[PDB]
Amino acid sequence: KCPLMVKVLDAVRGSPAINVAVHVFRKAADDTWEPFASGKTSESGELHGLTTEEEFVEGIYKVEIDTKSYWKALGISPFHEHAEVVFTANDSGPRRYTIAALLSPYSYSTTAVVTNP
Amino acid sequence: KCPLMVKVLDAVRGSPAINVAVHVFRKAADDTWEPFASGKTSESGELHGLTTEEEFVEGIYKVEIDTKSYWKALGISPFHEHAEVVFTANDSGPRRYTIAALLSPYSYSTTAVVTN
Amino acid sequence: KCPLMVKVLDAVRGSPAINVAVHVFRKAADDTWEPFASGKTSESGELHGLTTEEEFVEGIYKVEIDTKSYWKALGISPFHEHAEVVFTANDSGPRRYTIAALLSPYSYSTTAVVTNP
Amino acid sequence: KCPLMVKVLDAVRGSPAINVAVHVFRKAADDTWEPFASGKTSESGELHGLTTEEEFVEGIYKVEIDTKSYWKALGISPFHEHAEVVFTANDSGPRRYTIAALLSPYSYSTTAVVTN
Ligand SMILES: COc1cc(/C=C/C(=O)/C=C(O)/C=C/c2ccc(O)c(OC)c2)ccc1O
Ligand SMILES: COc1cc(/C=C/C(=O)O)ccc1O
Ligand SMILES: COc1cc(/C=C\C(=O)O)ccc1O
Ligand SMILES: COc1cc(/C=C\C(=O)O)ccc1O
Ligand code: NA
Ligand code: NA
């Protein structure tokens, strides 16, 4: 909940994007993506509880949002396979990260809100 | 064609937004919006030929894009009455402005590309 | 708080946009913009308490965010005079509206989240 | 130049994002990313000539834009390592794709324009 949150919105319906799968990976020493955490957005479009302050160490993380399944379920054939962000976390000490994504069938926009606990 | 261009994209269909009405206004000394230029986007989502260098002086301009009519034509319920973009232009003299807009039914994004 | 909320984020700093002025207008019978409510975003980038369920009737509303003052205070000369959205509210009965804006010096993006109470 | 174009804009400076590195990969049968094409954006923020119709077959493609290096060159601390854009292309045969990206230090937006 605390250190990594994901929020997903639907720009076609003006709503949270509900029950969207989110997969988080962390780059290992051998430069491969290791599975780190995953979950589904709630009825508010939010995903909390992915990790903890102890587990969320320095690293390069990928957050991969399964936008394709979301659109397909609504009868839309979308462009992207997913929406993903890749970022270095906690380089200058622990921070809280909110990754927000705004979804359309042929477009997405993502931002990060980073705060110091 | 040169000093002020508008380009509109459709984020739902992954295409230019074609036949979108665009009106441009300039702020008058009494803070009312005076009609300045208008047009409809082409098949490429672009609208050129709005003004000339001589006519486009420093001032506050409003570009109003009729997004509601566009979505209604597609049978999609939209949130906004329109998308407008208000900016100060040609202080520091003439400049070249492209106002781009990316449209979704319940969201839009606009950016300005100001080049040479 | 309930029926109309505004949230503003800074895409340059990855932060809420704090202490941003927001002015709300409602179109009168004579097609003029009448002042409806105003406020400032908090340290979380949020503005609650603008109106109430009784006051927020059907109408065409404008939300005008003073982005120019925000950027100027940070030493940036931005493009826009403001970021504004214009929308019809409560056409099909009362709804809750969240207007979110994401700000950059030469760009902004706005979305609406509309829910049924 | 024809089937796959990339265009990158800078939302902070209101300009094309120039000299941005772009790498394109195609997903291999073993789910690894195989190098496909690359280049740097021009003075107009555009990158043409990546592939040809014959080479650009249906598959899953990744366009990876090195946004971090771009912001570092400007002395601005960025959030993302890069901006990547993953999509399935030429099922239903060849198509024309423009991948556009709008960059800020802590945000980006991408849209696809798929025309005739
Ligand atoms: C219109 O522009 C966009 C808006 C959004 C919405 C993002 C969103 O809801 C963000 C959030 O809900 C996160 C907000 C936030 C604000 C201040 C804080 O100090 C904080 O950490 C404690 C968190 C997402 C994508 C967009 O393109
Ligand atoms: C990808 O996000 C965006 C793209 C554009 C398109 C600009 C152009 O085609 O020149 C405009 C606004 C956006 O938010
Ligand atoms: C939605 O706005 C329009 C779009 C088009 C182009 C293609 C189409 O028919 O969708 C033509 C006229 C329109 O008014
Ligand atoms: C930030 O990336 C670049 C931008 C430019 C163009 C103009 C400038 O100097 O800012 C040139 C080389 C770069 O690597
Ligand atoms: Na460090
Ligand atoms: Na009604």
Looking at chain A, which residue has its C-alpha nearest residue D98? A106
Q: Count interface pairs A-C at CB distance under 8 A.
A: 29
A43–chain D nearest CA distance, Å: 24
- Give the integer Cα–Cα distance in Å for B62 and C8: 22
Nearest ligand, CA B100? 2
D43–chain A nearest CA distance, Å: 24
The domain limits of chain A are 1-117
Enclosing H/E stretch for A98: strand A96-104
Name residue A57's beta-bridge partners: none
**Cβ–Cβ gap C14/A113 under 8 Å:** yes
Hey, what CATH topology would domain A1-117 get? Immunoglobulin-like (2.60.40)
Resolution in angstroms comes to 1.3
Looking at chain A, which residue has its C-alpha nearest residue B79? A14
CATH for D1-116? 2.60.40.180
Residue D71 Cβ < 6 Å to ligand 4 = no
- Nearest protein Cα to ligand 2, atom 3: D102
- B113 alpha carbon – ligand 2 mean position (Å): 10
Q: Is D1 exposed, middle or buried (0-12, 13-18, 19+ CB in 10 A)?
A: exposed
Q: What is the DSSP letter of B45?
A: S
- Give the integer Cα–Cα distance in Å for C67 and C83: 6
Residue B56 Cβ < 6 Å to ligand 3 = no
- Nearest protein Cα to ligand 1, atom 17: C44
Residue D110 Cβ < 6 Å to ligand 2 = yes
How determined?
X-ray
Q: Count interface pairs B-C at CB distance under 8 A.
A: 52
Are A5 and A97 in contact, with CB atoms under 8 Å apart?
A: yes
Residues of A in contact with B13 (CB under 8 A): 105-106
B/e letters for C32-62, b = 16+ CB within 10 Å, e = fewer, are ebeebbebebeeebbbeebbeeeebeebbbb
Cβ neighbours of C116 (radius 10 Å): 8
Q: Is C11 left (phi over 0), alpha (psi -120 to 50) or beta?
A: alpha
Nearest ligand, CA A96? 1
Q: Token pair 């970022």 is at which residue?
A: A87
Sign of CA pseudo-dihedral A102, D63, A89, A56:
positive
- The CA–CA distances, whole Å, from C92 to A101, B59, D6 equal 28, 40, 42
Residues of D in contact with B109 (CB under 8 A): 102, 109
Q: Is C93 left (phi over 0), alpha (psi -120 to 50) or beta?
A: left
D44 touching chain C per CB within 8 A = no
- Nearest protein Cα to ligand 1, atom 7: A100
A45 phi/psi in degrees, rounded to 5: 80, 10
SS3 C1: coil
Closest by Cα among B98, B82, B88, B95 to B23:
B82
C95 touching chain A per CB within 8 A = no
Q: Mapped to the 3 state alphabet, what secondary structure does chain D carry?
A: CCCEEEEEEECCCCEECCCCEEEEEEECCCCCEEEEEEEECCCCCEECCCCCCCCCCCCEEEEEECHHHHHHHCCCCCCEEEEEEEEECCCCCCCEEEEEEEEECCEEEEEEEEEC
Closest by Cα among B107, D62, D15, C101 to A81:
D62
CA torsion, ordered B79, B105, A100, C109, to nearest 10 deg: -80
Residues of A in contact with B105 (CB under 8 A): 11-14
CA torsion, ordered A97, A102, A108, A112, to nearest 10 deg: -20
- A7 belongs to an annotated ligand binding site: yes
Q: Are strands A21-27 and A59-65 parallel, antiparallel or unpaired?
A: antiparallel
Residue D5 Cβ < 6 Å to ligand 2 = no
- Give the integer Cα–Cα distance in Å for A31 and A60: 10
